[PDB]
Amino acid sequence: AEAGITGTWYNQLGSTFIVTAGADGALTGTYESAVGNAESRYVLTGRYDSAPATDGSGTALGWTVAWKNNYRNAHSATTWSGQYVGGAEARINTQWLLTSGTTEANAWKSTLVGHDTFTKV
Amino acid sequence: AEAGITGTWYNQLGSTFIVTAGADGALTGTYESAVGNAESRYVLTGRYDSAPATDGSGTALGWTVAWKNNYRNAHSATTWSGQYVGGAEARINTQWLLTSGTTEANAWKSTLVGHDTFTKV
């Protein structure tokens, strides 16, 4: 459901991401703050199942955002893995991994894990 | 099994954990950084499958360590989830989650994820 995924999504932390789902399974867009100021916009790229099951299952997808743009660099990257569920109350349920660039000594604490639920409202 | 799990294990990061596997699935012991140092010893408790399959599968187990003892407190807790594999090269392969006590605002970055492999040597 490329038509179902394409659009603006909001999470519970105050972040917004606009994405376009290509017919070829590509996901491209921008991840930004609620405000949308230029310094807080980051490129996002991912992939999704462009031919999901028809037994009522969700649509598997994932995307990545490296936290660097033309204004700032947080030397880290986050990947979201989850599935899109359509309907009147459509949502994208995800779990993410945030990895920071670290020295070998700090590699053990380089990755944070969490979960985000995105809605169209 | 019980006899296979009970004993001293070492990870690839310099930590040592001594555990005793009870007949009914209990795991009890100590997790320490350096021997002969009271300030680096912490209590560990967990559970394991005391009647694993006999098809060559590993033995599921998990344990927790709250990073507080009578000398220090890191206000955090780590849980290891994995399986014990017996043999000449016995080991415990795990994935862990380290959660720190945080304010509501920092809850999103409260949990670290990683993996440890423990060996008898």
């Binding site: 932390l13 105050g14 703050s33 609620a34 807080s40 936290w67 700032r72 986050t78 | 605002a105 999103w108």
Partner: peptide, 13 residues
């Protein structure tokens, strides 16, 4: 409060 882009950071800290 938020000092990382992921938690919706608007202004640098």
């Amino acid at each position: 409060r938020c000092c990382h882009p992921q938690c919706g950071m608007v202004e640098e800290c």
